Structure formats: C-alpha cells, structure tokens
UniProtKB/Swiss-Prot annotation:
Species for this entry: Rattus norvegicus (Rat)
Name of the protein described by the UniProt record: Glutamate receptor-interacting protein 1
Positions of the PDZ domain: 9-98
Lineage, highest ranks first: Eukaryota, Metazoa, Chordata, Craniata, Vertebrata
Domain comment (free text): PDZ 6 mediates interaction with the PDZ recognition motif of EFNB1 and EPHB2 and with the C-terminus of PPFIA1 and PPFIA4. PDZ 4 and PDZ 5 mediate interaction with PRLHR. PDZ 4 and PDZ 5 mediate interaction with the C-terminus of GRIA2 and GRIA3. PDZ 4, PDZ 5 and PDZ 6 mediate homomultimers. PDZ 7 mediates interaction with PDZ domain of GRASP1. PDZ 7 domain binds CSPG4. PDZ 6 mediates interaction with the C-terminus of liprins-alpha. PDZ 1, PDZ 2 and PDZ 3 mediate interaction with the PDZ-binding motif of FRAS1.
Subunit structure as annotated in this protein's UniProt entry: Interacts with EFNB1, EPHA7, EPHB2, EFNB3, KIF5A, KIF5C, KIF5B and the C-terminal tail of PRLHR. Forms a ternary complex with GRIA2 and CSPG4. Can form homomultimers or heteromultimers with GRIP2. Interacts with GRIA2, GRIA3, GRIPAP1/GRASP1, PPFIA1, PPFIA4, FRAS1, PLCD4, PTPRF and liprins-alpha. Interacts with ATAD1 in an ATP-dependent manner. ATAD1-catalyzed ATP hydrolysis disrupts binding to ATAD1 and to GRIA2 and leads to AMPAR complex disassembly. Interacts with SLC30A9. Interacts with BUD23.
Parent-protein start and end of this portion: 463 to 563 of 1112
Expression sites (tissue/organ): Expressed in brain, testis and retina. In brain highly expressed in the olfactory bulb, cortex and hippocampus and lower level in thalamus, cerebellum and spinal cord. In brain it is found in the perikaryon, dendrites, dendritic shafts, dendritic spines and, excitatory and inhibitory synapses of neurons. In retina, it is most abundant in the plexiform layers than in perikarya.
Length: 101
C-alpha cells in the first residue's frame, strides 16, 4: 500500500450518443462537503470516461482545456464538458492520490 500523488492528463472525446457521461462537482451539487473546488465524482455505465480506461471518482480537475476553474464553480465545470464539442475532444488535467499500492 504505497502512497503516491501526481497529476494525470485524461483526454476525452464527446461520444456520439451522450457525449460526456462524466460529471464534476465543485463541492456544491453534493451533500458531501461544500464551498470546495471542482472534481470528478460521477461516471456512466457507457460513457467515454468510464471506458477511457483511466478515469474514476476522485480525480481532482484543476486545469481542464486550460481553464483551471476559479475557487469553486460547478457551472464552470459543466461548461468545459460542453465546450469539448468544439474540437470533439477535451483534455482534463487532474490530480490523483494513490493510497493502496
């Protein structure tokens, strides 16, 4: 159970069905804590994020498509996901903390 902590660059592509079944809450749309920054905490059983083979609940998004969000803006996160349609794909910079090997 080694302890780690790094940032990952997960580039996703808007699926022709749903697009981005993955949701990121800025500690506002969840009863668990609030007034906090935006992060990933929701994936679909058929979304590019789930099938990305490198995404899960816990990823701290703080630099998506350039926009690292300001303080806390849930609406901002959703906007970034929708702004991915422009290029058909987005690059979300997240931070993970390994705590189990």
């Amino acid at each position: 159970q080694v302890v780690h902590t790094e940032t990952t660059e997960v580039v996703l592509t808007a699926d022709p069905v749903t697009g981005f079944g993955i949701q990121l809450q800025g500690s506002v749309f969840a009863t668990e804590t609030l007034s906090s920054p935006p992060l990933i905490s929701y994936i679909e059983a058929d979304s590019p994020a789930e099938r990305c083979g490198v995404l899960q609940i816990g990823d701290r998004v703080m630099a998506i498509n350039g926009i690292p969000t300001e303080d806390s803006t849930f609406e901002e996160a959703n906007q970034l996901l929708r702004d991915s349609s422009i290029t058909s794909k987005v690059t979300l910079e997240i931070e993970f903390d390994v705590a189990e090997s």
